[PDB]
Design a protein around this ligand. Structure first.
Ligand code: ALF
Ligand SMILES: [Mg+2]
Length: 991
């Protein structure tokens, strides 16, 4: 990204502090884009060699960052990256490796150990080795989360309610909002604390010094440029190191996800630039568990430190998941302009009828805050809490309830090979060559088939920690081994595996009758070449190349009778990933429901294609895409095994380096991505989300943490340090946890849409009720308002979010747009219908024989009792339940409506109490302050009107649920939009 920086330290000491303390009042609105507020007070225009306040200018992007420059040499912090100031270059440069300017291999040989000098300046420039996690206090979280326009409007509404006699419900809303705020702050603080505890590390390391002395200091004192000694026993790697002498076996499961040894060699050649990307076979990354180290020269291994902190992607992952981590804004705006037209119309009415003498600033703001209800967040959050409780009862832990509503529009789910789809360990089923005479290739054979020396070798050759040895001993049927049933065999000594010899030997000296034999295990080529004088090989390389192309691990065994010079091949041992039987139905249902599923793995491409073919991801065909090389003047060949594509690490890098061309095609048609780095996975997730894709990552290891956090939703299995930010977390390791989560998300989205529609209808009908009441010049009592807002709103919010998800996955996803055509059309029709039926009763009772008419001279809260106010209250209380029953759904993708017994009995009790309060007076309208009319014919007509409005709302819902004019009249169709569908149609047309 192309961006600049500029500034100046101070203008002048003086009245500037008073200016700041007097202009910090509009800071609430100056929070977003504070560059204008900063330049309005403190912004000198002069030479810019020394700066303290740094501002960000918009050159290619649209952002605004505020940074502070500290003096130690001056530098500032920006997205976790240090930027020191160079006096010779007169410009800011990033603190990282010198590979950008000039690099070579001679300095890596000449940097063997550093003295006490030049260490403090390097520590001040590069910073500490530990990754400092920025923690914030409680007021910091308060100012960061709160003080948005929504909470400001809610506080204004609360103050307005406190100004009136609305104390009870106002303090109720205040206390529930406070509980929600404290809960969110506690959750955020716990997340920050566990993230800081996971990221931080402290252990003793050995640092070499010039002269021939070694000291043990803390890991924070490690600065790029010294020498690090790897322990022989192994341990956690706190910083990046480059091998200079000797070789070591290290586990790269923190970056790939496989617990296999990685071949790491030294650097015997020199005079070459250090790219740190193509030399992965020489240097090793940080955070890798050390298994075994060795060196042919020197008493200890020699390794030089090249980069620490936010350089070797360690802090890079955190800085990439923290800061740039990626229908809202039109419904509230449409309700605001609608309220503005309604609040000014009431002013003209009040100024003419009674002239309330400055009581209009209270009645108009009342309608303003009634149009926009404050109980919407609670009514939308109760459903998420119910869904989280249901998931926890099922066995799925959730930490963020706001992601449940977003989890209903999933269309792309990522699956990991190791851990998620398969197990972490390596299993075994038997030995394919039943004889040691180079048998012809065939299907693999199960266990228990060999017997005698072969069975003894397969059951005794083990270093028992190692999951493969455990699988072998549990599959061989022998558990000193009992139930042989011949005489048991005993071992005396075993040779530990090392890096110098790739063959593990095991000697046996049992006192049995026959001659004992020694069994070894290692690379197949070595034992095959060694056993040549004993037995001849026939079709030996074909089996190895087939197992390598099919993603199989080869293990050979040899035997030699004794009373490593001579050996005799007996059989070959193979390994599998043990594909779970429950994985196939899940992906089958996903492909049936038109839910795209891709595979993101860190191993080679051959194993990825093998797993995809075994599970059934690519049914029609499978295509592989590989690039010739990385240097310019390259090509894009086509290799053969809708259309699915397979990519690799460097392949995806070369594709993403060509962003302005053919990248959306690869993102749409490509489904297999092997050897993907954590940063590469995060970049792929970001690029996919840039195409309006609801990508959902699902993994258990620590390598895919960046992709799991950068995605919209993250499913975490096998609880570990990589499950502290991900909202979805399942206790079991089964793959069937995805369909239930998708169903719960769809149900929550449908319930949230229904709640939003009901709230909009309630707000609009209350608005028109207040309008007609101001036309009549009378106001309802505060007690009635409180009673309604409790026993209707809380009742529906508790008894409408209990509906469970559908039985099976739906064919079509629910609409995730609150401003669509049918949703708006049905809402407008219901609104005009309720407006036509509500004011009708007033016009009807105006013609009926009426007694003791009201006088429009007394104040609004003093004209009670009267007929108009009580009939308006009755009509509104009836229409509330009418709308609540009309917006109730759940047939397509949820539980049936008749299954909700509590909601049904609550609606029945509400209707009963309403008809009791309407028909018969006494003992029910005492504190309600009503006229207590005794007109039987009027009550019968009101019940008939309620019934006809009921059946009319039912007919309207039934005819609007067909959406026939929304589909049959779609000319022109929905083309020229939904870029995913456009790319799909372009791909199916051009191919
Ligand atoms: F364990 Al992986 F991609 F193979 F996270
Ligand atoms: Mg994994």
């Amino acid at each position: 990204r192309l961006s600049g920086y500029c500034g100046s330290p101070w203008r002048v000491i003086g009245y500037h502090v008073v200016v700041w303390m007097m202009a910090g009042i509009p800071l609430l609105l100056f929070r977003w884009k504070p560059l204008w507020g900063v330049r309005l007070r403190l912004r000198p225009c002069n030479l810019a060699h020394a700066e303290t306040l740094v501002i960000e200018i918009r050159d290619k992007e649209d952002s605004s960052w505020q940074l502070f420059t500290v003096q130690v040499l001056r530098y500032y912090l920006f997205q976790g990256q240090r930027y020191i100031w160079i006096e010779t270059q007169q410009a800011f440069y990033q603190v990282s490796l010198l590979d950008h300017g000039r690099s070579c291999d001679d300095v890596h040989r000449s940097r063997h150990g550093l003295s006490l000098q030049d260490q403090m300046v390097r520590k001040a420039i590069y910073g500490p080795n530990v990754i400092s996690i920025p923690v914030k206090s409680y007021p910091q979280l308060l100012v960061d989360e709160a003080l948005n326009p929504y909470y400001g409007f809610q506080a204004f509404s609360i103050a307005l309610w406190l100004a009136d006699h609305y104390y009870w419900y106002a303090l109720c809303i205040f206390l529930i909002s406070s509980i929600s705020i404290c809960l969110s702050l506690y959750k955020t603080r716990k997340q920050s604390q566990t993230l800081r505890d996971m990221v931080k590390l402290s252990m003793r390391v050995c640092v070499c010094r010039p002269g021939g002395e070694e000291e043990w200091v803390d890991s924070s004192e490690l600065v790029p440029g010294d020498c690090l000694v790897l322990p022989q026993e192994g341990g956690l790697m706190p910083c990046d190191a480059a091998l200079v002498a000797g070789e070591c076996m290290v586990n790269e499961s923190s970056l790939t996800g496989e617990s296999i040894p990685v071949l790491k060699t030294a650097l015997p050649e020199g005079l070459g630039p250090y790219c740190a990307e193509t030399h992965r076979r020489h240097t090793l990354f940080c955070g890798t568990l050390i298994l075994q180290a060795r060196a042919y020269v020197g008493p200890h291994v020699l390794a030089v430190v090249t980069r620490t902190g936010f350089c070797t992607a360690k802090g890079g992952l955190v800085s990439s998941i923290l800061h740039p981590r990626p229908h809202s804004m039109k419904f509230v705006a449409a309700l605001s302009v609608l309220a503005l037209l309604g609040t000014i119309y009431s002013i003209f009415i009040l100024y003419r009828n009674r002239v309330p003498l400055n009581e209009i600033v209270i009645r108009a703001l009342d309608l303003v805050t009634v149009v926009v209800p404050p109980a919407l967040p609670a009514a939308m959050t109760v459903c998420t809490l119910y869904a989280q409780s249901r998931l926890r009862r099922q066995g799925i832990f959730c930490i963020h309830p706001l992601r449940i509503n977003l989890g209903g529009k999933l269309q792309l789910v990522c699956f990991d090979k190791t851990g998620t789809l398969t197990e972490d360990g390596l299993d075994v089923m038997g030995v394919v060559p039943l004889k040691g005479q180079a048998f012809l290739p065939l299907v693999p054979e199960p266990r228990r088939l060999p017997v005698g020396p072969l069975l003894r070798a397969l059951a005794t050759c083990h270093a028992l920690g190692d999951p493969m040895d455990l699988k072998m001993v549990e599959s061989t049927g022998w558990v000193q081994a009992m139930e042989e049933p011949p005489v048991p065999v005993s071992v005396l000594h075993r040779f530990p595996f090392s890096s110098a010899l790739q063959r593990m030997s095991v000697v046996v000296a049992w006192p049995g009758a026959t001659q004992p034999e020694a069994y070894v295990k290692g690379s197949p080529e070595l034992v095959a070449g060694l056993c040549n004088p004993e037995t001849v090989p026939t079709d030996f390389a074909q089996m190895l190349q087939s197992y390598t192309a099919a993603g199989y691990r080869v293990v050979a065994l040899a035997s030699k009778p004794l009373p490593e010079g001579d050996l005799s091949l007996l059989g070959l041992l193979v390994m599998r990933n043990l594909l779970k039987p429950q994985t196939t139905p899940v992906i089958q249902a996903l492909r049936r429901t038109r839910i795209r599923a891709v595979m993101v793995t860190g191993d080679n491409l051959q194993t990825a294609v093998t797993v995809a073919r075994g599970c059934g991801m690519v049914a029609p065909q499978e295509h592989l895409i590989i690039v010739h090389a990385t240097h310019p003047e390259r090509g894009q060949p086509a290799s053969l095994e809708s259309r699915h594509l397979a990519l690799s690490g460097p392949t995806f890098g070369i594709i993403v380096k060509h962003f302005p061309k053919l990248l959306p095609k690869v993102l749409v048609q490509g489904t297999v991505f092997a050897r993907m780095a954590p940063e590469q996975k995060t970049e792929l997730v970001c690029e996919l989300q840039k195409l309006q894709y609801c990508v959902g990552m699902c993994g258990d290891g620590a390598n895919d943490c960046g992709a799991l956090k950068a995605a919209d939703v993250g499913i975490s299995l096998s609880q570990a340090e990589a499950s502290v930010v991900s909202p979805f977390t399942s206790s079991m390791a089964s793959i069937e946890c995805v369909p239930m989560v998708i169903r719960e998300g769809r149900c929550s989205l449908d319930t949230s849409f229904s709640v939003f529609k009901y709230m909009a209808l309630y707000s609009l009908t209350q608005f028109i009720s207040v309008l007609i009441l101001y036309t009549i010049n009378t106001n309802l009592g505060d007690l009635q308002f409180l009673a309604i807002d409790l026993v209707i709103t809380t009742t529906v919010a508790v008894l409408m979010s209990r509906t469970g998800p559908a039985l099976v996955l739906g064919r079509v996803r629910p609409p995730g747009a609150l401003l669509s055509v049918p949703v708006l059309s049905s809402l407008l029709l219901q609104m005009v219908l309720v407006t036509g039926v509500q004011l009708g009763g007033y016009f009807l009772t105006l013609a009926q024989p009426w007694f003791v008419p009201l006088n429009r001279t007394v104040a609004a809260p003093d004209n009670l009792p009267n007929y108009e106010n009580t009939v308006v209250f009755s009509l509104s209380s009836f229409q509330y339940l009418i709308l609540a029953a009309a917006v109730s759904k759940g047939a397509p993708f949820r539980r049936p409506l008749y299954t909700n017994v509590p909601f049904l009995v609550a609606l029945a009790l509400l209707s009963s109490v309403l008809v009791g309060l309407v028909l018969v007076p006494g003992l029910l309208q005492g504190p309600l302050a009503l006229r207590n009319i005794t007109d039987t014919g009027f009550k019968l007509l009101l019940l008939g009107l309620v019934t006809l409005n009921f059946v009319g709302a039912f007919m309207l819902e039934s005819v609007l649920d067909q959406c026939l004019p929304a589909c049959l009249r779609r000319l022109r169709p929905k083309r020229a939009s939904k870029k995913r569908f456009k790319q799909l149609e372009r791909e199916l047309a051009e191919q």
